[PDB]
């Protein structure tokens, strides 16, 4: 069970997407490599939500 993705997604205010991440067995390490194509594939349908996740990963990486 990956708790690090739950924390990352809650911080973005995207906890409504956790049902998708859990069903798709997405860990934080896997999410980090997902772009618009991959996120649209798993059902993250709104461009603004995908951008929030993608920019959220860039900032998590650049911040560290």
Residue numbers in the entry: 874 to 937
What did the article's authors report about this structure?
Since polymerization was likely to hinder crystallization, we used the polymerization-impaired DH902/924RET2 mutant. Reasoning that the mutant domain would still retain most polymerization interface residues, polymer contacts would be recoverable at the high protein concentration during crystallization, as illustrated for other polymerizing SAM domains (Kim et al., 2001, Kim et al., 2002). We obtained well-diffracting crystals (1.53 Å) and solved the structure by molecular replacement (Supplemental Experimental Procedures). The TNKS2 SAM domain, a 5-α-helix bundle similar to other SAM domains, formed a left-handed helix with a pitch of 46 Å, whose axis coincided with the crystallographic P65 screw axis. The SAM domains interacted in the well-established end-helix (EH)-mid-loop (ML) binding mode. On the EH surface, basic electrostatic potential predominated while the ML surface was predominantly acidic, in line with the salt sensitivity of the polymer. The closest approach between the two surfaces occurred around the N terminus of helix α5, where EH surface residues A919T2, Y920T2, G921T2, and H922T2 engaged in a network of hydrogen bonds and van der Waals contacts. Y920T2 was the most buried side chain at the interface (125 Å2), interacting with various hydrophobic ML side chains (V903T2, I899T2, I915T2, and M907T2), which collectively formed a shallow pocket, as well as E911T2 and E897T2. In its non-mutated form, D902T2 likely forms a salt bridge with R932T2, which may promote another salt bridge between K928T2 and E906T2. Surprisingly, despite its importance for TNKS2 SAM domain polymerization, R896T2 was not involved in any contact.
